[PDB]
């Protein structure tokens with residue numbers, strides 16, 4: 001019961017018993033917390049509760065020290081001192097932002113703004129409190145039980161009465177009962193078991209509620225600037241392919257950490273792998289939140305780096321299939337590719353943390369705690385999508401609040417910016433450059449004259465709250481009959497239910513905007529589906545149209561984003 005104050009470090013025996021994370025608070029800080037919030041339970045070796053038999057006074061502001069014990073006003077001896085006096089709470093070794101983080105329910109955007117604008121120690125308290133709240137919320141959902149199994153990919157479910165039903169998308173991962181992790185897609189539902197198992201009737205599924213470990217490391221280590229490249233030894237013979245990044249690679253070696261904003265198709269993986277070639281003896285750990293981001297770095301490394309010095313770290317509790325071409329779980333290979341949640345405790349010359357817009361402060365801290373490195377390079381784009389905030393329902397989370405790295409990129413600017421999009425036709429580049437990049441993103445490709453837009457509101461139906469627009473899919477079907485090259489297009493929309501309908505009617509492969517992030521396709525067909533905050537989000541819109549290498553068709557619901565698209569308009 002002895003520790004350091006989460007607000008000012010001052011040693012104490014006090015912890016707030018009303019806070020879900022029970023943070024250590026020093027006398028001057030514990031007082032400022034109890035006296036300004038509904039939190040009145042204070043914990044020491046023994047709690048601050050009335051020692052008198054049968055008394056239920058637990059409020060610290062109504063308690064006094066009667067010798068060596070604690071008593072309320074009704075039970076205190078004549079010679080007693082109040083626990084709360086002269087701006088402090090009695091304890092050994094004798095905040096407006098801390099109060100809001102400690103008492104908020106994480107359903108408002110302002111709660112996330114505070115968690116990213118507060119002091120460093122309060123960023124860890126906020127990240128731990130938020131993650132713990134997100135887990136206890138998983139318990140609120142009802143259990144799903146198998147009523148009947150139709151096929152190897154379809155079943156019928158029986159839900160728990162009195163408890164709400166979680167959304168049925170790829171985002172919500174269930175645990176079968178331990179028959180492996182399972183996902184569902186919309187009376188027949190589509191099941192996807194991570195482990196192939198003959199679904200038994202009576203078996204049940206629950207969302208995996210995991211224990212939130214405490215955070216110790218900052219989201220960002222303190223910044224250091226050096227006069228020379230430190231702890232890294234550059235090649236003199238550097239491949240022409242990577243010459244464009246030489247100044248940026250030198251910047252990387254002359255700072256403790258560096259941020260790289262890379263818009264779509266500007267060379268983020270190329271930059272990341274080129275760093276290994278520029279500092280050929282450096283041990284580099286490549287990390288990201290998702291298996292897909294880690295695998296994309298592996299694919300790029302497979303092409304430029306010696307395969308024998310690479311290793312893909314995979315947790316024994318395998319959830320999805322991932323990269324197979326490197327030796328698995330060899331922590332000491334020069335190049336280690338691993339998701340944040342699976343990181344071993346190791347050191348490195350450089351840590352490259354990719355797809356930074358998807359990281360949370362919880363992830364930023366975990367990386368600093370598991371990896372001790374000479375240099376940290378954060379790669380991503382605050383104009384792309386953040387990690388879903390399951391509890392957030394009110395307000396929009398702006399990019400400067402996604403995490404500490406995105407906050408830096410949006411306030412002081414990134415240390416490095418990849419300014420030339422090599423993927424997209426110029427119509428797409430020009431649109432997103434003006435939309436989210438302050439006209440700093442340049443097109444490498446010419447206009448393809450295969451980027452089309454159509455303003456068609458159609459009809460919005462809903463599968464619970466996930467939206468469908470059949471008339472927008474009908475417009476796509478008509479377009480496909482006249483444009484056979486587009487037969488190979490990937491269908492993209494902001495909604496899983498829109499994608500499920502489009503899959504049956506069009507037969508095109510399907511992706512939500514969020515799942516398409518990091519991927520590229522020659523042709524993309526996008527149906528906005530609705531005019532909601534979700535489907536109009538500029539970061540989601542940016543990701544949606546930058547998936548295309550050759551052509552894109554956008555069937556739009558929103559006049560604003562439609563008018564912004566620098567595409568050829570189609571009639572009907």
Ligand SMILES: [Zn+2]
Nearest residue numbers: 005008026029
């Ligand atoms: Zn303090």
Ligand SMILES: [Zn+2]
Nearest residue numbers: 016018019039
């Ligand atoms: Zn508290």
Ligand SMILES: [Zn+2]
Nearest residue numbers: 050055072075
């Ligand atoms: Zn009492």
